[PDB]
Design a protein around this nucleic acid. Structure first.
Ligand SMILES: [Mg+2]
Ligand SMILES: [Mg+2]
Ligand SMILES: [Mg+2]
Ligand SMILES: [Zn+2]
Ligand SMILES: [Zn+2]
Lengths: 131, 136, 141, 94, 38, 166
RNA sequence: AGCCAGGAUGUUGGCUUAGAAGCAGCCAUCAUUUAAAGAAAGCGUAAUAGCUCACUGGUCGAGUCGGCCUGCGCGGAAGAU
């Protein structure tokens, strides 16, 4: 991996993404597949395009380092295998339950679908969204 | 085998091999095989080295042979006594001092060149080290 | 959706019913019979076009038959009748064998969009272009 | 660009040079222009490190000697015949 | 057992080791490759 | 020694061996013609015939250097054409084969050339002093481009051969 | 460094071959979904497949990597009362 600069840039990008958004979710592909990669990514593409980065890089001093800048509650999610999915278009989109669905339909696990932050929530399969 | 096509004299004195080389830099090519060890490279040995290095490279990129075996080394046959004049020229040698670049090489990666020169070095009787085309 | 049991993409032109010389043992390696790749194979083939190789999933289960869903034919065989020249690589950079325009490539691209694993069509188009280049056809942008 | 630390030689001669070499230094000299030639020692390893780049050979280098930042280009170098070493360096003032 | 003046890692799985002051290539992947200095 | 002997034998054999629809120039067949040795077309990527003063037409293979020169000099003697009906024999392949000379490489090459259904009309041979590179040009006769390609492949397959081309 | 996963799509890139599907070889050697995944480093097949690797994210919590410098040493190093 490259030194300081690139990482910093990445962090900045992540922060920016966070700023332009609201709802998010988590996923932990402990035994996932690149075929199953093309369900979530595919979905994202369908929704609009490339913008939605899965950004699997949940270090205590990388993705957690950018957490102090925007939405401080995500620091506790840091440990273990995780991939943060930030949403841009539409306030509280359908992408939260999507992960859960994927998990259900053969993907071993999905970080126990604990979710992220809209009312500072935790592990709840919230069907109530704008539709 | 490398050998002078014509000469003034058939037989040369033994002489001595003290001093360092003049052909010290990698003049032509990019990489060089620099004789650390003092001695004399016979023509045959040189040829062998060349074969090794050319083979190694796979005729990709050019190779130079800086040393030339210009000195005729004589021998007496077996069951011959010490007088009766100086013996006949069995082979030709290049007196190598420390510093003499023996082979140069370009048109290759560095690693490949090094590998080639390892093989070449094996052939040779003298200790040899890898060198590069230095600026100035 | 289970993982690797015995699924593999391996067949020549879709019009050629029951290919014994090209595929032969490969399609009937497992318990699936040779008779399965003709009646069931040409059912979906007649709905579109013949003379083109098209891949298909061969998830061989224990219960005789297998589930299958056809995908999309390659740009390889497409770039011959549509492109012009039927040859390609060997000496691409030394001398240009053939050449395609971008518009045509783009057009070709969007028909395959069902099979492609791309977010935007532009990306797909560029991939196609790249493929063409690799094959040995300098794009006329 | 390159700041080289040099010290003026109290003793010049073959033997002195040899001694310097032994003690991880090497004799160099500065010359050029109206000024007289200035023979210095150079701490060897640092110089070697510097001269791994072609930048060193091309660009003007700052030899610091007795609190004088002498701007010199490296003019000619004596390398050791069979070792990654520097016998001696010539420096032309720029 | 090869016993050479020159012992060398002949593959990535070959491992040099000094036993009783004797350099030895020992290899899990290929028992031909195992060597000794002698 | 054995290898050398074999090579010699092969050479001898070659020597022993040595001892009109073809080219329809511009929609009119049966024109006095011949393949030029500058580059010898068989099923080549088009041909061109230079109408000579004596000996009729000389076929050159299209995009030749000599032919280009001729065109530059005077275009009116040149005539573009098809490679006729493919002459039953369709002769003339010279195959230059560069190789690293060990004791028994040339012989091997010769052997490989034989057995395959190729009429060996001539074999030019020399060892270059620039290294120990054996270089050889086999004047051979064969009925198709595909066949030629196959032959080339076969030649290549003998690992001592560095490159084999016309 | 161990340990847990992935190591995909266009794709069987084309071509050349008898076949060649990362892997007889020859030539381009791109883009895509990308956290990252070589038109593939080695094994592997009649070719597919399969198994490792590079590269990637976690796991873990301190240095580690490999030159080139020389010092001393080790092997190389078997004989006869
Ligand atoms: Mg003295
Ligand atoms: Mg013991
Ligand atoms: Mg010893
Ligand atoms: Zn081994
Ligand atoms: Zn011609």
């Amino acid at each position: 991996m490259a030194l300081n600069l690139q990482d910093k840039q990445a962090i900045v990008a992540e922060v920016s993404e966070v700023a332009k958004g609201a709802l998010s979710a988590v996923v932990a592909d402990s035994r996932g597949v690149t075929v199953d990669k093309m369900t979530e990514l595919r979905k994202a593409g369908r929704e609009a395009g490339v913008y939605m980065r899965v950004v699997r890089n949940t270090l205590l001093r990388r993705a957690v380092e950018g957490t102090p800048f925007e939405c401080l509650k995500d620091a506790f999610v840091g440990p273990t295998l995780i991939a943060y999915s930030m949403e841009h278009p539409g306030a509280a989109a359908r992408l939260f339950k999507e992960f859960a669905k994927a998990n259900a339909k053969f993907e071993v696990k999905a970080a126990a679908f604990e979710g992220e932050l809209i009312p500072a929530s935790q592990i709840d399969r919230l069907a109530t969204l704008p539709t | 085998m490398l050998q002078p096509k014509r000469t003034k004299f058939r037989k040369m004195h033994k002489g001595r091999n003290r001093g360092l080389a003049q052909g010290t830099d990698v003049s032509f090519g990019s990489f060089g095989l620099k004789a650390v060890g003092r001695g004399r490279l016979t023509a045959r040995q040189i040829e062998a080295a060349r074969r090794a290095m050319t083979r190694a490279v796979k005729r990709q990129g050019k190779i130079w042979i800086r040393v030339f075996p210009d000195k005729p080394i004589t021998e007496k046959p077996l069951a011959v006594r010490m007088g009766k004049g100086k013996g006949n020229v069995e082979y030709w040698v290049a007196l190598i001092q420390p510093g003499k670049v023996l082979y140069e090489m370009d048109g290759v990666p560095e690693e490949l060149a090094r590998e080639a020169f390892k093989l070449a070095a094996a052939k040779l009787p003298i200790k040899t080290t890898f060198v590069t085309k230095t600026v100035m | 959706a289970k993982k690797v049991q015995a699924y593999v993409k391996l067949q020549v032109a879709a019009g050629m019913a029951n290919p014994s010389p090209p595929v032969g043992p490969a399609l009937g390696q497992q318990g699936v019979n040779i008779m399965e790749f003709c009646k069931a194979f040409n059912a979906k083939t007649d709905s579109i076009e013949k003379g083109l190789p098209i891949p298909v999933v061969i998830t061989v289960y224990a219960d005789r038959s297998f589930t299958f869903v056809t995908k999309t034919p390659p740009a390889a065989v497409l770039l011959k009748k549509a492109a012009g020249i039927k040859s390609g690589s060997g000496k691409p950079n030394k001398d240009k064998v053939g050449k395609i325009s971008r518009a045509q490539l783009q057009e070709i691209a969007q028909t395959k969009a069902a099979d492609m694993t791309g977010a935007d069509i532009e990306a797909m188009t560029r991939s196609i272009e790249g493929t063409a280049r690799s094959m040995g056809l300098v794009v006329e942008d | 660009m390159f700041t080289i630390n040099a010290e003026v030689r109290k003793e010049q001669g073959k033997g002195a040079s040899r001694r310097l070499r032994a003690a991880n230094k090497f004799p160099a000299i500065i010359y050029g222009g109206k000024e007289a030639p200035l023979a210095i020692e150079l701490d060897h390893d640092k110089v070697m490190n510097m001269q791994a780049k072609a930048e060193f050979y091309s660009e003007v280098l700052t030899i610091v000697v007795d609190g004088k930042e002498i701007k010199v280009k490296a003019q000619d170098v004596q390398r050791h015949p069979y070792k990654p070493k520097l016998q001696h360096i010539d420096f032309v003032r720029a | 057992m090869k016993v050479r003046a020159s012992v060398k890692k002949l593959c990535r799985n070959c491992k040099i080791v000094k036993r009783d002051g004797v350099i030895r290539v020992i290899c899990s992947a290929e028992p031909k490759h195992k060597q000794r200095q002698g | 020694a054995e290898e050398q002997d074999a090579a010699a034998l092969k050479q001898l054999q070659q020597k022993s061996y040595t001892p009109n629809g073809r080219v329809v120039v511009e929609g009119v067949g049966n024109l006095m013609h011949h393949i030029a040795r500058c580059c010898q077309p068989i099923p080549g990527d088009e041909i061109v015939g230079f109408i000579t003063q004596g000996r009729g037409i000389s076929v050159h293979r299209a995009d030749c250097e000599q032919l280009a020169e001729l065109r530059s000099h005077a275009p009116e003697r040149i005539v573009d054409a098809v490679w006729g009906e493919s002459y039953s024999a369709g002769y003339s392949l010279v195959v230059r084969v560069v190789a690293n000379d060990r004791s028994g490489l040339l012989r091997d090459i010769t052997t490989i050339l034989a057995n395959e259904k190729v009429n060996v009309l001539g074999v030019a041979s020399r060892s270059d002093t620039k290294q120990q590179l054996a270089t050889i040009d086999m004047t051979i006769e064969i009925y198709n481009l595909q066949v030629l390609g196959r032959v080339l492949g076969k030649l290549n397959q003998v690992p001592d051969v560095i490159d084999a081309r016309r």
